[PDB]
């Protein structure tokens, strides 16, 4: 019939780029990145870039159109929309003088500096991304090894101190219920760290953790961005622990 | 030491010689009708005489009386809810 | 309390079940935390310890050597350079029925 | 022979030459205790890289996220100064 | 008909100095006896290139550069502003007001004469082809020398076809029917 | 006087080479068999280097600085003569009339030309005969 | 000079009446062209 246009199918249809995915989800660049890393919307690669955009480079980033459309429908953009509207209602009551309204305020604002827990809440996008317990027991290994990293950290605006302290109560709640299942199999002293592996339910758990020491953060890193995967693996932790004591018959939290 | 292989290609700005560089324009945009009206708006109360009965509001409180009337008004704010 | 593990589109896409993208060589998938040997502890064997040792020096010893070529190439670049500005100099010098 | 030419897990030290991001991923540091650095007791041990930095570069190897570099200044808005009007018009 | 016969607007380069243009092609403008000339300028701002359309004056050729602006010089095709110009010069498409893009002195073999100047207010005193004295603002602009195209009319049409040629293109009413040839219900003069 | 010699800067007005700039290795007043016509035997350039600005790093000043010659046999009617002048003795009979006769002196010709016109270039000197002309 | 004298007497009673905070940012504009600014839909 009518003969198609050049440029209206294919690779085109299939991938965007950062900047036009940033423009369709109308979110700001860090919660463009924290969502991505949150429900794993990975980087992707055309076989033609210049097929995709006639302005693309090498360090171009492409996406699927498809999993920006399924991030259309993330409920956590109306609560990046509250929280913004939210943070402009403090600043007005601070600006009026009314601090007692802005601490009323503030108190619903759930900061991860006064709760020690993430500023929002990622039970559905835990269950979103481990379908099974297997997957969550298989993920372990960077989970444990980021929050183990993560317990000896000194305090940053990125991720605070009672957050800190949280990590470090899970991980010390996971190592108790490895003491009391003897589910601990190998431990190894390497010149990075100390290795251990554990077997639970089948699964075999590796992780690394840090000796005791100063750890120096570089800035090689991009340490934001790990600490929005530090908030992930601490959600995550909290529901594998849980489960883990409730299989066993014990009350938890401890 | 610099590199030889860099040059200096300096450009005339002079009548019919090179295109003209991005200035601020700023005093030349043409507004919308609102901002257009309410600049006017004032242009035109600073143009034409004002009566005394409005010309007298324009004389206030200045910086150090307003803050020490706020200062003392402060302490006597209404009843909150 | 809440435990997981027991129009909206509910389902997820095939696009979003795909596998990331390896960085590795050959193109499987990178373990989290990989296994590590014997040479890595602190206390190692004496045949790891070596193996290591002999696997850094040699790349080191192809490092300093390809460091070593490069810097030669440069340097006899620069010289190339110099004599032909010399040359220019001169040059100018002189100059100056079926 | 052209169907003979037809015919004929990850590791960490070896990367692809494509890069995924602003640059290519650097070679690791030397972890590797020197012979002349070599202790005898757990006490007196030399840790050696970074756990942060291994973190985040199995993030980029694995694919979560490409690599970028830290912007340390941003541009800023081009804005020009000028005096307000009841400043201008103050008289004393 | 593609494009009106007008001049640049008035701005910066012909207020302050000059511009040069280039002429590509002097083409025939059906309904106007005298022929037109498509001259590209540079735009001062960017990079695209600028198409106008002027009225062409006797001995423009395709290859000329032509300036338009204060500074320009004393030559047929160039546009100046009458300030610019001595007594006794004859120039065309002279602008009523400056910034018009020219007025008067258009059609073919037609030109205006510069009588002369008054710079106490700036002042220019002209004479128009009828014969009539006006006085416009000395920076008007003006193109030097005489439209093209002159004795069109010292040619007899010789021809109702030449005639309903001419016209048809021009759209002026043709043929024209006498009122004391119509009915009294017609015409005033009719019967 | 005579002013189609040996390390005169030309432009090629005619063939695939239209625009660029060459310099005279021999001038052949005379003609020869083949060509039976004042000619020349030149040597020039056909992909100009690319711009060099203050930020850039060494591996793309390198990358960029590479230059692309070819050897011609060229008619006196196809060539714009210059005033500027460019002698080198590396470019000396670096070309014969039997060089184009065979693939592989043409090759090993103009590797001797892109070396000598690289180490001028990395001089810094004759500007004008790197820059491309704009037309 | 008397003229600069002034000016830095004039400049600190505006200090002292009127506060420190004389002046204000206005964007640079590079076009004459206003658009209607792109918001949260």
Redesign the interface.
């Known amino acids: 019939g009518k003969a198609k246009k050049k440029g209206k199918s294919g690779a085109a249809r299939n991938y965007m780029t950062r900047t036009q995915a940033v423009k369709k989800l109308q979110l700001s660049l860090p919660d463009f990145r924290k969502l991505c890393i949150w429900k794993g919307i990975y980087p992707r690669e055309p076989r033609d870039r210049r097929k995709v955009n006639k302005s693309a480079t090498a360090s171009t980033t492409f996406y699927y159109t498809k999993d920006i459309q399924y991030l259309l429908h993330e409920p956590l953009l109306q609560k990046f929309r509250e929280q913004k509207a939210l943070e402009k209602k403090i600043s007005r009551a601070l600006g009026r003088g009314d601090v007692s309204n802005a601490a009323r305020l503030e108190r619903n604002a759930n900061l991860p500096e006064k709760t020690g827990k993430p500023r929002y809440t990622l039970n559905h996008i835990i269950r979103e991304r481990y379908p099974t317990f297997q997957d969550a027991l298989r993920d372990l290994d960077d989970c444990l090894s980021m929050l183990f990293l993560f317990a000896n950290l000194p305090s940053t605006t990125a991720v605070p101190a009672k957050m800190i302290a949280r990590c470090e109560r899970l991980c010390h709640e996971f190592q108790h219920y490895l003491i009391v299942t003897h589910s601990l199999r190998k431990s190894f002293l390497s010149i990075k760290g100390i290795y251990y592996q554990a077997n639970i339910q089948g699964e075999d758990i590796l992780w690394l953790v840090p000796y005791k020491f100063n750890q120096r953060i570089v800035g090689d890193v991009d340490f934001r961005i790990m600490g929005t995967f530090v908030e992930f693996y601490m959600t995550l932790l909290g529901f594998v622990n849980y489960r883990l004591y409730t299989s066993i018959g014990l009350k938890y939290p401890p | 030491p610099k590199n030889p292989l860099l040059e200096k290609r300096p450009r005339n700005f002079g009548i019919g010689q090179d295109i003209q560089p991005k200035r601020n324009l700023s005093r030349m945009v043409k507004w919308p009708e609102y901002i257009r009206l309410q600049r006017q708006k004032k242009i035109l109360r600073m143009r034409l005489k004002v009566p005394p009965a409005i010309a007298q509001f324009q004389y206030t409180l200045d910086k150090n009386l307003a803050a020490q009337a706020f200062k003392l008004l402060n302490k006597y704010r209404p009843e909150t809810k | 309390t809440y435990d997981p593990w027991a129009p909206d589109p509910l389902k997820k896409p095939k696009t979003l079940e795909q596998k990331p993208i390896s960085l590795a060589a050959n193109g499987k998938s990178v373990p989290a935390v990989p296994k590590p040997t014997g040479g890595y502890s602190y206390n190692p064997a004496f045949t790891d310890y070596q193996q290591r040792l002999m696997e850094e020096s040699e790349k080191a010893i192809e490092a300093e050597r390809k460091r070593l070529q490069e810097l030669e190439l440069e340097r006899q670049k620069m010289e190339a350079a110099a004599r032909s500005a010399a040359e220019a100099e001169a040059a100018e010098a002189r100059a100056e029925k079926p | 022979q052209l169907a003979l030419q037809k015919i004929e897990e990850g590791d960490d030290t070896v990367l692809r030459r494509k890069q995924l991001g602003k640059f290519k991923l650097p070679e690791k540091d030397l972890e590797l205790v020197l012979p002349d650095e070599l202790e005898d007791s757990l006490r007196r041990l030399k840790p050696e890289g970074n756990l942060l930095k291994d973190r985040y570069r199995s993030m980029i190897v694995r694919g979560k996220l490409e690599a970028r570099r830290k912007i340390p200044f941003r541009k800023q808005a081009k804005t020009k100064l000028t005096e307000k009007w009841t400043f201008k018009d103050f008289r004393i | 008909r593609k494009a009106p016969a007008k001049f640049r607007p008035l701005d910066?380069?012909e207020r302050?100095?000059?511009?040069?243009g280039i002429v590509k092609e002097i083409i025939h403008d059906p309904g106007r006896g005298a022929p037109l000339a498509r001259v590209v300028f540079?735009?001062?701002?960017?990079?695209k290139q600028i198409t106008e359309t002027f009225i062409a004056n006797e001995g423009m050729y395709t290859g000329q550069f032509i300036y338009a602006?204060k500074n320009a010089a004393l030559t047929v095709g160039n546009i100046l502003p009458l300030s610019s110009v001595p007594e006794g010069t004859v120039v065309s498409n002279v602008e009523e007001k400056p910034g018009d893009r020219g007025a008067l002195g258009r059609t073919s073999g037609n030109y205006v004469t510069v009588v002369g100047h008054n710079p106490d207010e700036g002042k220019t005193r002209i004479k128009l082809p009828s014969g009539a004295k006006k006085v416009v603002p000395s920076s008007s602009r003006g193109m030097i020398g005489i439209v093209a195209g002159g004795g069109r009319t010292d040619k007899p049409l010789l021809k109702a076809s030449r005639a309903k040629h001419k016209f048809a293109v021009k759209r002026n009413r043709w043929p024209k029917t006498r009122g004391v040839a119509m009915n009294p219900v017609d015409h005033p003069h009719g019967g | 006087m005579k002013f189609l010699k040996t390390s005169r800067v030309c432009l090629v007005t005619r063939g695939r080479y239209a625009g660029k700039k060459v310099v005279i290795i021999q001038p052949v007043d005379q003609g020869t068999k083949s060509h039976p016509y004042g000619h020349a035997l030149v040597a020039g350039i056909e992909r100009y280097p690319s711009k060099i600005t203050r930020r850039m790093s060494k591996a793309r000043i390198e990358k960029r600085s590479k230059i692309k010659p070819f050897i011609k046999v060229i008619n006196y009617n196809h060539l714009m003569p210059t005033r500027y002048t460019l002698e080198l003795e590396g470019l000396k009979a670096v070309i014969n009339a039997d060089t184009f006769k065979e693939p592989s002196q043409r090759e090993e010709a103009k590797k001797t030309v892109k070396k000598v016109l690289e180490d001028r270039y990395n001089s810094g000197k004759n500007r004008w005969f790197f820059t491309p002309l704009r037309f | 000079s008397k003229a600069a004298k002034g000016a830095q007497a004039k400049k600190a009673a505006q200090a002292a009446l009127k506060g420190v905070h004389s002046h204000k940012k206005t964007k640079v504009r590079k076009s004459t062209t206003f658009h209607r600014p792109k918001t949260l839909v």
């Not at chain 5, 302050?16 to 040069?20: A, Q, T």
């Open positions: 910066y380069a302050h100095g000059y511009i040069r540079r735009s001062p701002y960017k990079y602006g």
